Curated annotation (Swiss-Prot), chain A:
There is a cross-link at residue 85 (Glycyl lysine isopeptide (Lys-Gly) (interchain with G-Cter in ubiquitin)). Transmembrane segments: none annotated. The gene is NFYB. The lineage of its organism: Eukaryota, Metazoa, Chordata, Craniata, Vertebrata. The chain holds residues 56 to 143 of 207 of the full protein. Residues 31-42 are annotated as: Subunit association domain (SAD). Can be divided into 3 domains: the weakly conserved A domain, the highly conserved B domain thought to be involved in subunit interaction and DNA binding, and the Glu-rich C domain. This is Nuclear transcription factor Y subunit beta.
UniProtKB/Swiss-Prot annotation, chain B:
It comes from Homo sapiens. This is Nuclear transcription factor Y subunit gamma. Heterotrimeric transcription factor composed of three components, NF-YA, NF-YB and NF-YC. NF-YB and NF-YC must interact and dimerize for NF-YA association and DNA binding. The lineage of its organism: Eukaryota, Metazoa, Chordata, Craniata, Vertebrata. It is found in: Nucleus. Belongs to the NFYC/HAP5 subunit family. Component of the sequence-specific heterotrimeric transcription factor (NF-Y) which specifically recognizes a 5'-CCAAT-3' box motif found in the promoters of its target genes. NF-Y can function as both an activator and a repressor, depending on its interacting cofactors. It comes from the Eukaryota.
């Protein structure tokens, strides 16, 4: 069981609800589990794409293909922008 | 700030799949942003059920309910069942 740090997860959650809203510890842990499941789900499809393209290292295009294929196409443009800004 | 998320941890999660051995440097960066977008949408959707129940505390059952209402979350149906 490998998860993103609970405090980082909780901070992102808190930003999405009213200032006085509260989050049960068990709900934070649940979202931790869900995020790892999300990473694994996308990565599995990206791995298949990588192999199909005669490669061995899963790249950004593989991840984006996976997101589009698996019902997360709306993530593609924001992700491309974020990566561009990150490397610029 | 999405840039705050630990990329080594994201890479470790990816590598839990035994078939996943080599990962580009850029892939964890993409996942850091994706994780923020995903957590935000999942939390917002759970909070719909929190508010519907006139509660101020978001609970696991609210997340379970949200998962059933969005086919993008189909992959989580058996992870967080109602």
């Amino acid at each position: 069981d490998i998860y993103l740090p609970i405090a980082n997860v909780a901070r992102i959650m808190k930003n999405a609800i009213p200032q006085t809203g509260k989050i049960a510890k068990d709900a934070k842990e649940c979202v931790q589990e869900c995020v790892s499941e999300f990473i694994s789900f996308i990565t599995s499809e990206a791995s298949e794409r990588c192999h199909q393209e005669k490669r061995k290292t899963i790249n950004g295009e593989d991840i984006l293909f996976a997101m589009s294929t698996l019902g997360f196409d709306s993530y593609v443009e924001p992700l491309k922008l974020y990566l561009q800004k990150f490397r610029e | 700030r999405v840039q705050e998320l630990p990329l080594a941890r994201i890479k470790k999660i990816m590598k839990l799949d035994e078939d996943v051995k080599m990962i580009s440097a850029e892939a964890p960066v993409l996942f850091a942003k994706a994780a923020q977008i995903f957590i935000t949408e999942l939390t917002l959707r759970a909070w719909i059920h929190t508010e519907d129940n006139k509660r101020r505390t978001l609970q696991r059952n609210d997340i379970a309910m949200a998962i059933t209402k969005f086919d993008q979350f189909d992959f989580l149906i058996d992870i967080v069942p109602r």
